[PDB]
Amino acid sequence: GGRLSVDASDIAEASRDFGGVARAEPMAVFHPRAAGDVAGLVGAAFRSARGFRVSARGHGHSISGQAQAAGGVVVDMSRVARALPVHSAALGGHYVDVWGGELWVDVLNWTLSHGGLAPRSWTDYLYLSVGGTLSNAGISGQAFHHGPQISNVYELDVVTGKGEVVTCSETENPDLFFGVLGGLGQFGIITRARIALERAPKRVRWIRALYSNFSEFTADQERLISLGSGGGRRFDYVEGFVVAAEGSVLYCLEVTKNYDDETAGSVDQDVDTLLGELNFLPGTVFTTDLPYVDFLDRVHKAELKLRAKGMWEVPHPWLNLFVPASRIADFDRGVFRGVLGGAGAGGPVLIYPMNKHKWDPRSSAVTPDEEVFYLVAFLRSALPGAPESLEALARQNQRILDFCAGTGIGAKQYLPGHKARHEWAEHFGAARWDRFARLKAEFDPRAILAAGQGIF
Ligand SMILES: *Cc1cc2c(cc1C)nc1c(=O)[nH]c(=O)nc-1n2C[C@H](O)[C@H](O)[C@H](O)COP(=O)(O)OP(=O)(O)OC[C@H]1O[C@@H](n2cnc3c(N)ncnc32)[C@H](O)[C@@H]1O
Ligand SMILES: NC(=O)c1ccccc1NC(=O)Nc1cc(Cl)cc(Cl)c1
């Protein structure tokens, strides 16, 4: 049912990603119509003499060629009939079956228009594929409470590296299910994901507050993510970002309170009660009220403004770290004040804590060995048409990694950009590496899938 393409625009797109550095060209791009077509192509790679590389491409948002299949085939998973949300009395809630290539923005619009339902856990950017985020984790300000998107999926259909279509969940083929979740595309291509849904809020009370004291900023973020664990008043989203003085450093706390027709009468009091317990700088509270879809789509709005200034399609040497909360204080003087002290085209530096117990330890996701850890995301872009800007940002990234290494911070890379075998063994640790290698031997022995990750 599917078709191979050698269109130069298709080859060019499959040869690049949002990072703008890795450029390994495939021989062709495969456009599937259904799961059987993907099984057909992977099965042919497995049976073939050479065993050509096959990688699925979501929206191409990888930073360092993770979706590239050098001299092989890139499966363009982008999109046909769609399954309606379903209620289950056994699960005690709703779910929706989605194609692996579906973008979260399209999932949201579908579930809202069919019962006013929505996924509970997001990414900051919705123009990402379901299969792509589920192969990593999928985090945003809801992860402290609902866990990442890999903690909000009931079942998958996976095309293994042998071209076999397998339905898997916690009860059926769990090794493949938990292996695939956070599995960096190593054990198969997700063709269907069964996403957990909740009754969507209608609106969002979106708040930002400034801090000059890092100890107060982190203590407040850590206090906020411990709320609702006892079932009470809490925010529905907890993020943060590092701000430069002009326009020495400030920390911005970013929170939301979700509401609908029922809770609209208690939203102002819930917000004031939660904010009264915090230590932000007086007079630095910025508030906005907008529809839920608009809050969730906030980064796409920033993107359209950047595309207008020719500032979107530039190199993105983005670095994402998970930092144990016990070492976050040291992280600030050495990195935010140290390494970054004194930038390129600019970009956010995100910072917020998450609860490890919301992450299933059976999945392939690698988190620090601590109950509370932070995402620290260095999302700086290089200047357009200025290669030296990319070089300076890459040296800053290596300085951050050397700082963590030299002070023994047990940080773990999110969307790991490792390429050496000893870096991967170190990343996973002995037990996880052993589980990872064994899963690879079982589901992708010829190392056909997602070879751009550079693990096998
Ligand atoms: C560009 C970007 C990325 C991003 C983000 C904002 C922007 C502007 N915000 C994020 C956020 O708030 N939280 C988060 O967790 N991630 C965020 N990201 C990063 C994003 O998750 C990753 O880039 C991820 O790779 C998903 O992006 P995409 O859908 O474009 O996928 P890809 O880059 O093409 O592929 C990634 C890897 O997975 C394999 N792959 C792709 N599709 C599948 C399927 N269906 N099944 C199995 N494996 C799959 C690729 O081969 C590659 O290895
Ligand atoms: N305010 C933002 O979150 C933002 C603004 C402009 C461009 C990107 C944005 N956010 C973003 O890219 N978040 C993201 C990006 C990655 Cl690669 C990984 C993770 Cl955990 C988070």
Domain extents in the chain: 1-76+446-456, 77-201, 202-414
Amino acid at 233: R
Q: 86-88 and 54-57: which strand pairing?
A: unpaired
Q: Whose C-alpha lies nearest to ligand 2, atom 13?
A: 124
CA of 133 to the centre of ligand 1 (A): 5
Cβ atoms of 233 and 257 closer than 8 Å: no
Kind and range of the H or E element at 205?
Answer: strand 203-211
- Is the CB–ligand 2 distance for residue 349 below 6 Å? no
Q: How far apart are CA 133 and CA 184, in angstroms?
A: 9
Question: Per the structure block, which two tokens stand in for 129?
Answer: 């594929």
Q: Which two tokens stand for residue 322?
A: 């998970």
Q: Is the CB of 125 under 6 A from ligand 2?
A: yes
Separation between Cα atoms, residue 147 and residue 182, nearest integer Å: 13
State how far the alpha carbon of 335 is from the alpha carbons of 61, 240, 264, 378, 382, in Å: 26, 16, 41, 11, 19
Taking the C-alpha atoms of residue 14 and residue 55, their distance in angstroms, rounded to an integer, is 10
Q: Distance between CA 135 and CA 131 in Å, rounded?
A: 6
Measured in residues, the chain has a length of: 456
Which residues make beta-bridge pairs with 209? 253
Residue with tokens 């009860």: 171
Q: Which two tokens stand for residue 145?
A: 């409470």
Tell me the C-alpha distance between 201 and 224, whole Å: 20
Contact 204, 295 (CB under 8 A): yes
Q: For residue 385, give the nearest of 16, 20, 4 by alpha carbon.
A: 20
Taking each helix axis as running N to C, give the angle between helix 421-428 and helix 430-443, from 0 to 180 degrees, rounded to the nearest 10.
110
DSSP 315: -
Work out the angle at residue 94's Cα, subtended by the Cα atoms of residues 90 and 95, and round it to the nearest 5 degrees: 105
Looking at the DSSP bridge assignments, the partners of residue 352 are: 375
Enter the resolution in angstroms: 2.0
DSSP-based helix, strand, coil % in the chain, nearest 5: 35, 25, 40
Q: Which of 323, 395, 385, 388 is nearest to 356 (CA)?
A: 323
Residues annotated as part of the active site: 61, 124, 239
Task: Report whether 445 contacts 187 (CB < 8 A).
Answer: no
Residue 286: CB atoms within 10 Å:
11
What is the Cα 279 distance to its own chain's centre?
30
Cβ 124 under 6 angstroms from ligand 2? yes
Q: Which of 62, 74, 78, 374 to mutate to test ligand 1, by most ligand atoms within 8 A of the CB atom? A: 62
CA dist 150 and 171 (Å) reads 16
Type of residue numbered 94:
H
Nearest ligand to the CA atom of 134: 1
Q: CA-CA distance, 409 to 325, in Å (whole number)? A: 10
Q: Could you give the residue ranges of the DSSP H alpha helices within 169-323?
A: 174-180, 214-224, 267-276, 292-296, 298-308
Torsion sign, CA atoms 107, 109, 111, 116: positive
Q: What residue type is assigned to position 82 of the chain?
A: R
- CB under 6 Å to ligand 1: residues? 18, 55-62, 66-67, 77, 100-101, 123-125, 128-129, 131-133, 135-140, 184-185, 189-190, 415, 450, 452-453
Q: Tell me how the structure was determined.
A: X-ray
- Integer angstrom CA distances of residue 212 from 97, 107, 254, 346: 45, 39, 15, 21
Atom of ligand 1 nearest to the CA of 148: 15
What are the residues whose beta carbons fall under 8 Å from the beta carbon of 70, sequence distance 6 or more? 24, 25, 26, 53, 451, 452
Q: How many angstroms separate the Cα of 13 from the Cα of each of 57, 61, 150, 277? A: 10, 11, 27, 49
**How far does the centroid of ligand 2 lie from the alpha carbon of residue 18, in Å?**
12
Do 81 and 57 contact (CB within 8 A), yes or no?
Answer: no
Q: Write the CB contacts of 64 (distance below 8 Å, at least 6 apart in sequence).
A: 17, 19, 21, 22, 417
Contact 373/356 with Cβ under 8 angstroms?
A: yes
Strands 54-57 and 73-76, by their bridges, are parallel
Q: Which residue has the tokens 């890999």?
A: 150
Which distant-in-sequence residues (6+ apart) come within 8 Å of 48 by Cβ?
none
Q: Give the ligand with the smallest distance to the CA of 239.
A: 2
Query: Residue 3's beta-bridge partner residues?
Result: 31
- Amino acid type, 10: D
- Cα separation of 292 and 200, whole Å? 8
